[PDB]
Design a binder for this molecule. Structure first.
Ligand SMILES: COc1cc(-c2cn(C)c(=O)c3cnccc23)c(OC)cc1CN(C)C
Length: 296
């Protein structure tokens, strides 16, 4: 369907590739043109969307995958629904949030993640899936104020019928800034699917912190900052992150003003339960979803 796509506007270009707003059948779509170095992400993401029933309000809706020719060279395209509001990362820098808006955002992420993490059997079945690169840049904002999780190019799958764990063959690794300590110290047990879910939870806790900083209380708010903004530079290294997270065992600071708001009080408690150095102690996505349903 790439041949019937007119690229209307490029919204991003980087080492990974380009993302375009396009029209297909006169409708808005998002087009990712992968870079040459990332074909295995195109393969894995295409594989996930074509072999698993992934329809969910909080998971980015897949439309099609294709190979096409431009500049006498092969381009790999992935096409998805288009979300006018863009990434949560960009959204948080353009606006502040009230209590309803903040909770709607984080609950929607928890619901998407819990849907990924659980295996469903029968007609609506899906294997359990871990994401492995959760971050606010990989979350889109919808018009109704909920979010949807995007990018399954690093996803790992597990199915109970076979007890089969399907890791990729993708040499891509997660975003370093969001890597849990067991990833940075390379002690993660790679043959146990729960390890990957617990890595997602660590990253979700960081996203929770990013979003809650932008919720207004007592007429004040924090500026947007990425996690560990104060202790690592942009494009942090493996050594940078490992020293902060593994040795010094640092966690994002809770701003004092959160404790004069009941909602940010509970969110601070929640995000800390995702950041335990011991991975088995972290909350599950279902437990996080349940709790976020109870806040307010
Ligand atoms: C099109 O494929 C994707 C598009 C986007 C995407 C990015 N930006 C910046 C957007 O504004 C946007 C707006 N609407 C819909 C989607 C996007 C994405 O989020 C990072 C993940 C994939 C999936 N895959 C290539 C990993």
């Amino acid at each position: 369907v790439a041949r019937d796509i007119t690229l209307l506007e490029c919204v991003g270009k980087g080492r990974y590739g380009e993302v375009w707003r396009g029209s297909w059948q006169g409708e808005n779509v998002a087009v990712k043109i992968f870079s040459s170095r990332d074909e295995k992400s195109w393969f894995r993401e295409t594989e996930l969307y074509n072999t698993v029933m992934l329809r969910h309000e909080n998971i980015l809706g897949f439309i099609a995958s294709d190979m096409t020719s431009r500049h006498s060279s092969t381009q790999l395209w992935l096409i998805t629904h288009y979300h006018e509001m863009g990434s949560l990362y960009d959204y948080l820098q353009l606006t502040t949030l009230d209590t309803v808006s903040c909770l709607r955002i984080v609950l929607s992420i928890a619901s998407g993640l819990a849907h990924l993490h659980i295996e469903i059997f029968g007609t609506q079945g899906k294997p359990a899936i871990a994401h492995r690169d959760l971050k606010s840049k990989n979350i889109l904002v919808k018009k109704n104020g909920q979010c949807c999780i995007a990018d399954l190019g690093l996803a790992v799958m597990h199915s109970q019928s076979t007890n089969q764990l399907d890791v990729g063959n993708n040499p891509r690794v997660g975003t370093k800034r969001y890597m849990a300590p067991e990833v940075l110290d390379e002690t993660i047990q790679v043959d146990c699917f729960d390890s990957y879910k617990r890595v997602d939870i660590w990253a979700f806790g960081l996203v929770l912190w990013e979003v809650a900083r932008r919720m207004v209380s007592n007429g004040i708010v924090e500026d947007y900052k990425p996690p560990f903004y104060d202790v690592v530079p942009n494009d942090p290294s493996f050594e940078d992150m490992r020293k902060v997270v593994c040795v010094d065992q640092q966690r994002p600071n809770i701003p004092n003003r959160w404790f004069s708001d009941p909602t940010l009080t509970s969110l601070a408690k929640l995000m800390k339960e995702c950041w335990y150095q011991n991975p088995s102690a972290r909350l599950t996505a279902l437990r996080i979803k349940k709790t976020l349903t109870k806040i307010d």
